[PDB]
Amino acid sequence: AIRKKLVIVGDGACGKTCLLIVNSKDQFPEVYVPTVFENYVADIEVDGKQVELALWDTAGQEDYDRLRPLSYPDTDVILMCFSIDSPDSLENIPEKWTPEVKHFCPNVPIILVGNKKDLRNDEHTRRELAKMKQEPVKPEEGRDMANRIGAFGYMECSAKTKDGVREVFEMATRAALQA
């Protein structure tokens, strides 16, 4: 089998851990974990080839900035996430995540991922953003950002409903197999 390393980054609470858990496991017990601390491996088939994808979770909060790069050596693909319910998390894609990952992971493909897609039409989310004169991120804004930062692609998913989650990891595998 082909061995590749994936790292997931993005703003605190944008859904990174949930995304890794829902693709990897068949039962999600009630423990909250800031980062996956066991060795999660995605077994994915791409055009008749078996890829083993080691999934490396990272902490989004800034107090973890000094230790985060320990996760970066020898990465084959990056999942760079924001939350569709958070315009602020999208703004931090070009301002923080892109220069960090480009420094520590030169020439490594980035898949830009809009998480929490289920919240785009959620009434509570709409109201909480509306009170501050904001709204959920639109798909064209994700596309434009992926173009701006030089990402290999833009995808949307929901760890809650599972929509789009297989596709994210299958596309990450395809990107990782290019170099």
Ligand SMILES: Nc1nc2c(ncn2[C@@H]2O[C@H](COP(=O)(O)OP(=O)(O)NP(=O)(O)O)[C@@H](O)[C@H]2O)c(=O)[nH]1
């Ligand atoms: N509605 C909805 N909520 C989600 C989704 N994914 C995660 N959440 C919720 O968002 C919160 C943050 O999730 P989590 O995976 O812990 O975020 P994180 O990006 O790993 N945070 P950190 O960077 O601090 O480790 C949790 O309450 C979780 O239930 C999703 O697709 N939809």
Ligand SMILES: [Mg+2]
């Ligand atoms: Mg986490």
